[PDB]
Write a protein that binds this DNA or RNA. Structure first.
Lengths: 80, 99, 97, 76, 111, 96, 109, 83, 98
DNA sequence: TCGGATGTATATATCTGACACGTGCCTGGAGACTAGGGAGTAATCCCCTTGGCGGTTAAAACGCGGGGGACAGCGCGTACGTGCGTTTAAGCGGTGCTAGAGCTGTCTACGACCAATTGAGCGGCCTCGGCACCGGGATTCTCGA
DNA sequence: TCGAGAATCCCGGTGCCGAGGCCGCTCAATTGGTCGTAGACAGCTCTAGCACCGCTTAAACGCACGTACGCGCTGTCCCCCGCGTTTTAACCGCCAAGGGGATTACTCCCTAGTCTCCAGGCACGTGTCAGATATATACATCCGA
C-alpha cells in the first residue's frame, strides 16, 4: 500500500506556484512527501487519542479541530 | 514556425492565476486513501466523517504553502532562483521544527 | 422527531452587520467563521482574567480583571478603543436602573 | 482657515479652523453648528481616518481641502 | 403586588450582545468561585466592538469587488491587510481564504 | 514575630535523590529549579485533564483523565513508562 | 476506640504527598468534583520524572569529579537527552550555559 | 532623576563576547547598531508587560514574580527565581 | 620579530573559553541604567527589586545568544564566514517576528 | 619536513561560608458517619457510512529540442584581526535614612440561593432574487524582425 | 525600433438553490426577597531600596600594520521548460445494507460535608568540611625556518 505516491508531481508544482516559486529543482518532491507524511502522522495520532478517550468508533470533525488547536495551529470555519 | 514562449513566462502566468483563486489543489480520493492508510497503524477498523477529511486537507495545504514561501525566501537570499532541498532543511531548522 | 437545541451568535452578528452596512448579506461559512472567532476571543479573555484573579489570592472576578486582561491581550489602538467602549457601557448600565 | 466637509446627506458644510486645530476642537465646532454628537461622526481625508489624539497639522489638511463625513449607529 | 414589565439587561446598557448569556457562561465555565455584576457588560461591549470592526472591513472589501454578500475570501482580505488584526490572528488559518497577491521583485522579467 | 509558612517540594526531592544516588548533595539554586519544574508540569497536566473533562460533558476528573492527559503531553517512551508507573501505583493503593 | 493513622502516601508506596496533591487539585478550580484515584496517579508520574532527571544530573556531576549538583549539571543532563530536550524545548535554565559545538567549516585547514 | 543616552552602555566588546559564546568567528562593522535596536525592542515589550502586572495590584515596587509572569506570557518561561 | 598569531586562532580560543563557562557578560550598572530609563516611559517614580533586574538580564542574554546562533547558520548557508545585518534580518523574518 | 615560545592542565596547601542536621510546635491531614445526586447500564430508533456499477472526459505520463542558469576559476583591494600604550569608570566596603510592603481588626455592602412567570430565541417551511454558466467580441500583452 | 497571434476581460441572456423571513412553542432569563461573609479601610512595625564617599585596578579606547576574504568577471556544460500525443482513473449519478451514534429511564454507590484528634513539616539555631584561591610546574600546541 504505497498510497504516498498518489500525491503527484503536478500537484506539488501547483502548491509551489501558489506559494510564489518560479523555478523548481528535480529533488523537491521526495522532501515534500516526507514532510507531509510526518505532519499527518502527528495530527492523526492526536485525533485518534481523543477519539479513543471519547469511547467511540468514528473520528468526528471536532476532535480534529481539538488536535490542530493543541499544536498551536487553530482552524476556523469547521464547527469550532 | 510554431509560436513558443520564452522559458519563464508561463511560470508567472501560473503564479498569478493560482494565487488569484481559492480552490484546493490535491485530488480528494488519493488524499483520503493516504489518510486511511496512515491512520490504520494506530487502530484497526476505523471510520471517518467527510468533514474531518476536508479539515485535514485544508490544514495540510496551508502548511505546505507557508513552508514553500519560506523556502523561496531562503533560496533567494543565497543569490539563486531555483529552490533546492537544502533550502527546505535550513528553513525547517530555523523554524525550530526539526531537531 | 426530537432535535436538541444548539446555540450560536448568529442573530447578534447579523444585527451588527445590518447596523453598520445597511445593504449587505452574509453566507453560512462566514457566519461559522465569525462564531468561531467570537468563541476563541471569549475563551482567551476569560482564561486570562481567571489566572490574574488567582495570582492575587482573590475569589471574585470583577470589571477590573477584565480591563487588565484586555490591556494585556490586545495591541495598542484596539486596547484603547476597547477600554473606552467597556467603560462607557458599564457607566451607562450603572446609571440606569 | 476653511475646510469643506461632504456629508452623507449630500450637503457640504464649511468649517473655519486653523492648521494647529485639534480634532476635539473641530468636534466642538460641529456640535455647535449642527449638534450631531461627536462619537457619531468620522472624517476621511486622502483616504485616511482622522483620530482624536492628533492634530489637523499631522494629517496635512490645507486650504480648500475636502473631507468625507461618515455616520455609524452607536445608540447610547 | 404587580410585577413590572421585564427589561433585558442588554437593553439597559444600550448593547446588542446578550449580557445574560455571557453571565451564565462565565458562571458555569469554572473560572472563579464568584462572578461580579459588572464583568458581563464589559465583555459584551468588547466583543461587540471587535465584531463591528471586522464586519466593517469585510464589507468594504466585498463592496470593492462589486458583490452584495460576504464570503471567506473577503474576510481573509480584510484581516490580512490590517497590521493590528493580522498580529492578533497570527497563528490562525481561515478556510477558503487563499493568499495575498505578491511576487518577489527580482523574479520579474528583465528589461 | 516569626514569618509565615511557605510550602515547597524540597523534602521529597531530597528523598528521591538519596534513593537514586546515595552519596550526592545538591545546592540551593538546583532545588529552586526542580521546584519550578515540578510545579510547571503539575499545572500543565491538571489543565489538560480539566479541558478534556469539559469536552465530554462531564463534571468530575478521574484516573482516566489523568492517563489520557499524560498520553497526550509526554513523548513516547516517557509516556509508556509513566503510564506503567501510574497504573501500578493505583492498583497497589486499591489492593490494600 | 480509634486506630493509628497511616498516610495515603504510605499506602500507595510513594515519596510524594498524596493529600497535598488532592487539596491542590480541589482548590485549583479545575472541576466540580475530584475523584479518589487521581492524586495517586499524579504523584506517581511526578516522582518518576523527578527520579529520571535527578539520575541523569547526578551522573553528569560525578563525571566532573564533584559531590554536589549545580545548575550546569542539570542543563547538561537535559540538553544531552532527546525526549527531555523536547519536553523542555521552550524553557531557559538560569546559570545553564551552552553545549560545546563548533561548525566544521570554521575549523582551520 | 531623568536619564538620557544609556543605550550606548552596551559596549562593542560585550556584543563581541556574546557573539563568541554564540559560535561566530568573524563580525562585520555594522552588527552592533542592529543588535542595540533588537535588544531595545525586546526590553520594551517585557517591561511593558511587567509594569501592567505590577499596576494591577496597587503596588509601587516591581517584583521578580511580575517579571516571571510577563516572561511566561510570551512563551519563554524561566526557571530558578520562584513560581 | 615579535611573535604574532595568524588571524583566526584567538577567535577559536575565545569561542572555546566562553563556551566552557557560565558567568554573565554584560556589565551590571549600565544594564540597570538602561532598564530604568526604558521603564521611565510607562510610569514615573518606580522602584525595582534586584532579583527582577537579574532575571531581565538572564532572559535578554539567552535570547541574544540564540539569535546569534541562528544568524551564524544563515551566514554559513550562503558560502560565507562573516556575518552581516541581512543575516539577522532573514533569521528574524523566518522565526515569525515583525 | 624540525624547534623555540606561549597557553593550558596538573598537583599541593588553606581557610571560609554554605550545607546538613537537631528541636518545638501548631496547623493541616487522617478516622468515622451521613445523604444525595452523578454516572453506568439496558433498550430503542434511524441516520449516515461503506460498497458497487457504468461512462466520460479532463488530467497525468512520456518524449524531444534547446536556451538559460548553476558552478568553477581568477584577479583585486579593502576592511578586519592582533598587539600596544593610555584613560576611564565599574566594583567593593562601609554609613543613614525613610518610604512602603506586610500583618491585624472590623464592619458593612454585595453576591449566592429559591419560587413564580413570561417573552426571547430556536426549529420547520417556503419563495424568489443574486450569482454561476455559456457564448460573443474588444483588449492587452509577448516575441520575431 | 516595429507587427502578427494568443490569452484575458467586459457584456448579455438565462436558470437554479439557498438566504431571508414567517409561525409556533418550550425553556431560561426576570423580578422579588433573604442571609452570610469577602473585602475595603485604618493603624502599626520593621525591612530593604536609595543615596553617598573613597580607593584600586581591570577593562574600554584609540592607533598602526598586514593579509585573507568578499566580490565582480568570464567561460562551460547540462538540465529544466514548453509543447505535442497517448493512456487512465477521478468524478458524477444511482442504488442497498446495516452498524453505530444519539435518547430515555432506572438504580446503586461515590464523593462532599462535618466533627474530633494528633503528628509531620516548617522556622530557628549551630557546627564543620567541599571547594574556591594562590602558587609552582609539566605538557600540548602553534608558527618559521
Amino acid at each position: 500500500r504505497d498510497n504516498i505516491q498518489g500525491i503527484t508531481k503536478p500537484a506539488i508544482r501547483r502548491l509551489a506556484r501558489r506559494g510564489g516559486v518560479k523555478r523548481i529543482s528535480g529533488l523537491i518532491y521526495e522532501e515534500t512527501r516526507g514532510v507531509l507524511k510526518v505532519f499527518l502522522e502527528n495530527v492523526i495520532r492526536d485525533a485518534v487519542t481523543y477519539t479513543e478517550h471519547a469511547k467511540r468508533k468514528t473520528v468526528t470533525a471536532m476532535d480534529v479541530v481539538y488536535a490542530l488547536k493543541r499544536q498551536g495551529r487553530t482552524l476556523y470555519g469547521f464547527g469550532g | 514556425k510554431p509560436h513558443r514562449y520564452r522559458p519563464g513566462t508561463v511560470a508567472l502566468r501560473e503564479i498569478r492565476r493560482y494565487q488569484k483563486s481559492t480552490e484546493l489543489l490535491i485530488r480528494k480520493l488519493p488524499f483520503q486513501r493516504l489518510v486511511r492508510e496512515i491512520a490504520q497503524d494506530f487502530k484497526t477498523d476505523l471510520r471517518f466523517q467527510s468533514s474531518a477529511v476536508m479539515a485535514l486537507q485544508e490544514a495540510s495545504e496551508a502548511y505546505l504553502v507557508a513552508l514553500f514561501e519560506d523556502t523561496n525566501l531562503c533560496a533567494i537570499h543565497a543569490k539563486r532562483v531555483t529552490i533546492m532541498p537544502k533550502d527546505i532543511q535550513l528553513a525547517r531548522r530555523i523554524r525550530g521544527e526539526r531537531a | 422527531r426530537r432535535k436538541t437545541r444548539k446555540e450560536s451568535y448568529a442573530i447578534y452578528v447579523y444585527k451588527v452587520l445590518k447596523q453598520v452596512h445597511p445593504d449587505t448579506g452574509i453566507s453560512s461559512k462566514a457566519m461559522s467563521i465569525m462564531n468561531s472567532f467570537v468563541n476563541d476571543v471569549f475563551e482567551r479573555i476569560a482564561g486570562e482574567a481567571s489566572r490574574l484573579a488567582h495570582y492575587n489570592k482573590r475569589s471574585t472576578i470583577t470589571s477590573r480583571e477584565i480591563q487588565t486582561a484586555v490591556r494585556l491581550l490586545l495591541p495598542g489602538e484596539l486596547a484603547k478603543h476597547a477600554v473606552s467602549e467597556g467603560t462607557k457601557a458599564v457607566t451607562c448600565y450603572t446609571s440606569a436602573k | 482657515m476653511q475646510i469643506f466637509v461632504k456629508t452623507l446627506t449630500g450637503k457640504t458644510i464649511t468649517l473655519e479652523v486653523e492648521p494647529s486645530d485639534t480634532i476635539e476642537n473641530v468636534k466642538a465646532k460641529i456640535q455647535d453648528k449642527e449638534g450631531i454628537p461627536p462619537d457619531q461622526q468620522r472624517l476621511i481625508f486622502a483616504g485616511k481616518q482622522l483620530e482624536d489624539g492628533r492634530t489637523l497639522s499631522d494629517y496635512n489638511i490645507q486650504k480648500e481641502s475636502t473631507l468625507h463625513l461618515v455616520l455609524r449607529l452607536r445608540g447610547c | 403586588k404587580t410585577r413590572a414589565k421585564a427589561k433585558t439587561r442588554s437593553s439597559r446598557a444600550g448593547l446588542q450582545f446578550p449580557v445574560g448569556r455571557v453571565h451564565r457562561l462565565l458562571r458555569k465555565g469554572n473560572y472563579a468561585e464568584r462572578v461580579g455584576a459588572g464583568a458581563p457588560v464589559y465583555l459584551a461591549a468588547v466583543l461587540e466592538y471587535l465584531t463591528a470592526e471586522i464586519l466593517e472591513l469585510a464589507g468594504n472589501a466585498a463592496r470593492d469587488n462589486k458583490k452584495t454578500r460576504i464570503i471567506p475570501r473577503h474576510l481573509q482580505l480584510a484581516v490580512r491587510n490590517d497590521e493590528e488584526l493580522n498580529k492578533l490572528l497570527g497563528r490562525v488559518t481561515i478556510a477558503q481564504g487563499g493568499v495575498l497577491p505578491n511576487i518577489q521583485s527580482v523574479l520579474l522579467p528583465k528589461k
